[PDB]
Amino acid sequence: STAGKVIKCKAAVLWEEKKPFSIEEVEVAPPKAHEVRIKMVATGICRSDDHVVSGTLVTPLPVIAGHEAAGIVESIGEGVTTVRPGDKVIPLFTPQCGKCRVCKHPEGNFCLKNDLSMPRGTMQDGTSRFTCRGKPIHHFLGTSTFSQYTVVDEISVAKIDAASPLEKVCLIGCGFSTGYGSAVKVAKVTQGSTCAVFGLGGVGLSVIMGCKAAGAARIIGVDINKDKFAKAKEVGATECVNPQDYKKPIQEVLTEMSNGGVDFSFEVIGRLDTMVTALSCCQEAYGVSVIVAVTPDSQNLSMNPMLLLSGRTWKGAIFGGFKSKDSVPKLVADFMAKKFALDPLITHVLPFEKINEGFDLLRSGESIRTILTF
Ligand SMILES: [Zn+2]
Ligand SMILES: [Zn+2]
């Protein structure tokens, strides 16, 4: 009925930088070999999407953004073997080709087939399945979830539980998985340990949740906005510290509080200064500090390697260090198994068409996470 031919639908198009999203009638081309066409059900608004808008994250324009979502597969191309029409699916902004050195390496997940490093803004074959008035529209990280229908390469989609709430499990496409994974997979937080999370936004809450899952005894939440503390404690935070309430430097406060430094610290804001703070505040001989996010508009941090010589470990990851296709389904499984909540993160729900409004909520910071329903 719809398989095999072009689909006319609405999508959120960004024609230029620092411009609101324009709701356009686009033509989504059918999936070629090893491609999957998805009917979007719910997509989240992540800060990285806003980074496209502000030109911070350089990627080809015009483009259809979005990378945190879920939906239903309407059809598949010839060769697609991992998903079938009707399957609930979550697109992967970080691929899992399962062939490159990385996918084969037990510690890597940043698949070399990604479009993050050197953005092309296309499907794997270098072309686009998007057109708006005959004009071509770029893809975003091989996902482009800001559309009623999108087309992704097979390596960029994972089949999930056929009974999962897409309005909720979409956070596994990025937000939740990133924070949670940073604690559980990346940092590998241990029981009885003390953790310090910098930034209590959606991702910070996910990290906290990861620490709580890992059995941390103390989860010190750090943020200058007191309004984020209740949600924090609610998700696991044992304590909350607002740096503006202190005269002494924050690492000094965190060091003393942890009687010598924390076990694991995570920076989730993307701030160069707090990145060094987080690192310092963890015990000098065996602390681990995790970089969960870094703003695209590159700027170097200034740090003394002496902080590392004593024994500290500094490391970051993308998508919580999870191998996308293998992890996503399991994470949805663990959600369906009540192993963690997603609702504490979902703070606003808007119809897809009010996307701009959702971004206004983001920029104002009065939002933890907005979900656009189609
Ligand atoms: Zn994201
Ligand atoms: Zn790969």
Swiss-Prot record:
Top-level division of the source organism's lineage: Eukaryota
Keyword Iron part of the UniProt annotation: no
Subcellular localization(s) per the UniProt record: Cytoplasm
Residue numbers binding Zn(2+) 1: C46, S48, H67, C174
Modification N-acetylserine occurs at: S1
Annotated SMART domains: PKS_ER
Residues that bind NAD(+): S48, G199, L200, G201, G202, V203, G204, D223, K228, V292, A293, V294, F319, R369
GO cellular component, one term: cytosol
Pfam families reported in the protein's UniProt record: ADH_N, ADH_zinc_N
InterPro entries linked to this entry: ADH-like_C, ADH-like_N, ADH_Zn_CS, GroES-like_sf, NAD(P)-bd_dom_sf, PKS_ER
Catalysed reaction equations from the record: a primary alcohol + NAD(+) = an aldehyde + NADH + H(+); a secondary alcohol + NAD(+) = a ketone + NADH + H(+)
Family affiliation: Belongs to the zinc-containing alcohol dehydrogenase family. Class-I subfamily.
Name by which UniProt lists this protein: Alcohol dehydrogenase E chain
Species, as recorded: Equus caballus (Horse)
